[PDB]
Amino acid sequence: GKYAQKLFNDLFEDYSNALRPVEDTDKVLNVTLQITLSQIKDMDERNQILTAYLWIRQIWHDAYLTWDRDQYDGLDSIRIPSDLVWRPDIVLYNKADDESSEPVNTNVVLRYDGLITWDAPAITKSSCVVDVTYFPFDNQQCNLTFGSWTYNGNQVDIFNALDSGDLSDFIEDVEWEVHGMPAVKNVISYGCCSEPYPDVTFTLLLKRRS
Amino acid sequence: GKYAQKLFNDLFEDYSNALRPVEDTDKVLNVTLQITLSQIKDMDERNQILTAYLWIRQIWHDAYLTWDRDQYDGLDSIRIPSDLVWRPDIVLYNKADDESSEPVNTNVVLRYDGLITWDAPAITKSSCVVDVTYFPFDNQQCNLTFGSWTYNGNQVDIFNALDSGDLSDFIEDVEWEVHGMPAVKNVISYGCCSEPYPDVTFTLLLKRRS
Ligand SMILES: CCN1C[C@]2(COC(=O)c3ccccc3N3C(=O)C[C@H](C)C3=O)CC[C@H](OC)[C@@]34[C@@H]5C[C@H]6[C@H](OC)[C@@H]5[C@](O)(C[C@@H]6OC)[C@@](O)([C@@H](OC)[C@H]23)[C@@H]14
Ligand SMILES: CCN1C[C@]2(COC(=O)c3ccccc3N3C(=O)C[C@H](C)C3=O)CC[C@H](OC)[C@@]34[C@@H]5C[C@H]6[C@H](OC)[C@@H]5[C@](O)(C[C@@H]6OC)[C@@](O)([C@@H](OC)[C@H]23)[C@@H]14
Ligand SMILES: *[C@@H]1O[C@H](CO)[C@@H](O)[C@H](O)[C@H]1NC(C)=O
Ligand SMILES: *[C@@H]1O[C@H](CO)[C@@H](O)[C@H](O)[C@H]1NC(C)=O
Ligand SMILES: *[C@@H]1O[C@H](CO)[C@@H](O)[C@H](O)[C@H]1NC(C)=O
Ligand SMILES: *[C@@H]1O[C@H](CO)[C@@H](O)[C@H](O)[C@H]1NC(C)=O
Ligand code: NA
Ligand code: NA
């Protein structure tokens, strides 16, 4: 039995990873986003830049990658290279650099109901602002703002999977403690009649250790 | 031929101005907002407060105030005191004072298809920020941010009627010229699962006259 092979061949026989996988163009595709903070690599106070190591988990539905489990011997999920499927082009809007790191290879897990889960590591560089005004009163506020590069909110709509950045895999920094990393979702539209532009923003608040 | 009286009695026989006028409470009510800037009453640079005179036009559909024109001898619109109908409780979120004007009497125009139009004057007081960085390089940025006080975005959703503040009725200020008043719509939601909170913001940019 080569059921996974057969399923793969059946699924991608006529599949384009360039196309937002909705049946209807003016229907939206929803993506949830989870940010896991691995490590504060550097809080540069000279240039006010945070370099962080992150994991990004994106979850969405692909209308064209579903199957009947009964036709494939009960097989209900497969893990494949991520570049085989359409992926949301979510990026850090407020990146401080135009520097491009070489893309690590990643995989997606594809479930029989078209549910796709994608974990990817990332090094981010972004500006922070000193804050000595709000509790705990000796801080660096480091916003991380994420969204689609090319799709508006009626094409790809983005949601926070969690109330905050995920700190459960975090390794402590000797100089900075993480006070909080609350997540919000912003949507802006211009004038009467523009398309909506959503983001999710994590406000990483760092407290200077004493 | 007292058709307007007959219509009024028929419309308001069993009507409550306390209830958001949707047939299904889980459905949204859409409101469009137009701001007309009448006058800059005071640009207080000591306290960084703008006092402005505005007209606010709100338009929305009332599901319970529709009628068949052909049943009322073709009557298709009536003008009545505004406190007779449910009204959106849109307010200036970023008001600077406790501390409001005594409310004046206003009217709404009610169209046969349930479309209600409501003009009301307002005196607003709000903080501004000095800006000498961006063109035209000697400015006051005065944001005016409006939204419902008690309803979230799934209950009452607000939209800009125009691309900008309406300046067609504006009387010039001797000290300040209006450089622009672009309008945007912002929506924020907190964490994974909160309701959405929309506003419309007018960024009134004032240029100092030399
Ligand atoms: C295709 C690249 N794309 C990147 C953009 C980038 O958007 C952002 O950076 C951004 C989005 C929401 C909130 C804040 C944002 N932001 C930041 O956080 C930093 C940066 C200054 C900024 O604008 C994504 C959304 C939209 O594309 C769907 C853009 C807008 C759509 C439209 C707008 O034209 C003015 C605008 C674009 O300029 C080009 C487009 O022209 C067809 C775009 O490049 C981005 O503008 C910043 C903006 C477009
Ligand atoms: C009922 C009064 N209402 C006024 C508020 C006030 O909202 C704002 O001032 C506001 C809204 C959007 C964007 C920016 C806003 N804002 C500010 O919050 C400060 C600044 C002046 C400003 O512009 C409207 C939205 C929501 O109510 C539907 C509120 C929130 C809903 C919820 C939130 O608490 C968890 C929050 C409230 O505190 C109370 C509520 O608890 C039942 C509320 O009073 C306002 O918070 C500022 C906020 C609520
Ligand atoms: C996208 O998410 C919103 C909010 O949960 C939901 O109402 C809508 O039906 C979703 N649309 C699709 C196509 O999944
Ligand atoms: C950081 O992001 C939060 C959430 O969007 C926002 O309220 C705050 O103003 C941002 N901080 C700065 C300095 O822009
Ligand atoms: C509210 O407005 C949007 C257009 O922006 C529309 O799609 C939606 O159907 C409207 N809802 C109601 C109840 O009018
Ligand atoms: C004024 O409002 C605009 C539009 O929402 C916003 O981008 C800008 O940051 C605001 N300015 C200040 C000083 O809050
Ligand atoms: Na959110
Ligand atoms: Na708008």
List, as one string, the DSSP characters of A139-164: EEEEEEEEEESS--TTTEEEEESSSB
Domain that holds residue A192: 1-210
B164 is in an annotated binding site: yes
Q: For residue B40, give how far its alpha carbon lies from the nearest alpha carbon of chain A (Å).
A: 22
Q: Would you state the structure tokens that stand for residue A114, as one six-digit string? A: 């078209």
B166 is in an annotated binding site: yes
CATH code for the domain of A64 = 2.70.170.10
Domain count, chain B: 1
**Hey, which residues 162-201 in chain B have their CB within 8 Å of chain A?**
162-164, 182-193
Q: Report the SS3 class of residue A13.
A: coil
CA distance B96 to B108: 28
Structure solved via: X-ray
**In chain B, which residues have their Cβ closer than 8 Å to the Cβ of A186?**
186-188
Q: Please state, as a whole number, how many other Cβ atoms lie within 10 Å of the Cβ of residue A18.
A: 5
Q: Report the SS3 class of residue A171.
A: coil
**In chain A, which residues have their Cβ closer than 8 Å to the Cβ of B59?**
none
Q: Would you state the structure tokens that stand for residue A88, as one six-digit string? A: 């949301």
Contacts of A176 (CB under 8 A, 6+ apart): A40, A43, A140, A206, A207, A208, A209
State the virtual CA torsion across B134, B137, B142, B145 in degrees, nearest 10.
-20
- Measured over the CA atoms of residue A9, residue A15, residue A18 and residue A19, the dihedral's sign is negative
Question: String of b and e for B19-57 (b: at least 16 CB within 10 Å)?
Answer: ebbbeeeeeebebbbbbbbbebeebeeeeebbbbbbebb
CA distance A103 to A81: 13
CA distance B161 to B59: 9
Smallest Cβ distance to A185: which of B159, B163, B188? B188
Q: For residue A100, give how far its alpha carbon lies from the nearest alpha carbon of chain B (Å).
A: 30
CB distance B207 to B179 below 8 Å: yes
Smallest Cβ distance to B163: which of A160, A183, A191? A191
Contacts of A177 (CB under 8 A, 6+ apart): A206, A207, A209
Q: Please state, as a whole number, how many other Cβ atoms lie within 10 Å of the Cβ of residue A26.
A: 7
A184 Cβ inside 6 Å of ligand 4: yes
